[model samples]
Target: MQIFVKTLTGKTITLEVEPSDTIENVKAKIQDKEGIPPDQQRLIFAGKQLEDGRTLSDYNIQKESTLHLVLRLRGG
Candidate 1:
């Protein structure tokens, strides 16, 4: 499953993953590119929050799906 991910920061990152990949995979890769923690990453796809425990296909997130990444509020 390959798609384009846009960060609220400034650029777009194209990611390629197996169909079996979880939402966290994308988040983790995003972190590799930008250093954002996966747990603190909130991704929105199809106007909804993407869950980590599910595969991209489970959410019908196919190629060309644009995922928007946002930061989860850090409560301390």
Candidate 2:
């Protein structure tokens, strides 16, 4: 299945992933594709923060769903 990840600036990308994929894996992929570090990425679906230890299936991330990506503020 596939899902959309959208940035605050309106940039978006399609991710082909399986239900078993962990949130950490998703961050890794985002890092690979967008140059954003995994530690700096935060993913939200259904308005809830996604935990790195959880799989997509845990949140029932449906195909074509869109996830919001927020970057962690640094040097605060």
Candidate 3:
């Protein structure tokens, strides 16, 4: 299945992951593509945090669905 990932920087990335992929796996892929770490990642779907360790099926994500990964900012 293909997943559409949108970053906080306004960059959209399309990745192909299996249906069994977990939230963590997707997060890692996003981090790899955007050079951001998982600790600084906040994935939100429909205004709710994509809770850690959940599978894509748990969220009912469909093929070519868009998932937003908002990188948490820190420091003054």
Question: Could you say which candidate leads in lDDT?
Answer: 2
State model 2's lDDT: 0.93
| Candidate closer to the true structure by lDDT (higher is better), 1 or 3 | 1
Candidate 3 local Cα displacement, residue 39, angstroms: 0.9
lDDT of 3 by residue, 7-76 (tens): 7678888988887788898878877887778878888776768866998889888799888877777843
Those runs of model 1 whose alpha carbons end farther than 4 Å from true positions after fitting are none
Model 3 scores a TM of: 0.84
lDDT of 1: 0.84
> Residues 1-76, candidate 2, lDDT per residue (tens digit)?
9999999899898999999999999999998998988999999998999999999999999899999999996956
Better of 1 and 3 by TM-score: 1
Ranking by TM-score: 2, 1, 3
The backbone clash count of each candidate, in order, is 0, 0, 0
**Local distance difference test scores for all models:** 0.84, 0.93, 0.82
Which pairs clash (backbone N, Cα, C closer than 3 Å) in model 3? none
Winner on TM-score between 2 and 3 is 2
Every model: Cα RMSD to truth: 1.8, 1.2, 1.6
Candidate 3 wrong stretches, greater than 4 Å: none
TM-score for every candidate vs. truth? 0.85, 0.94, 0.84
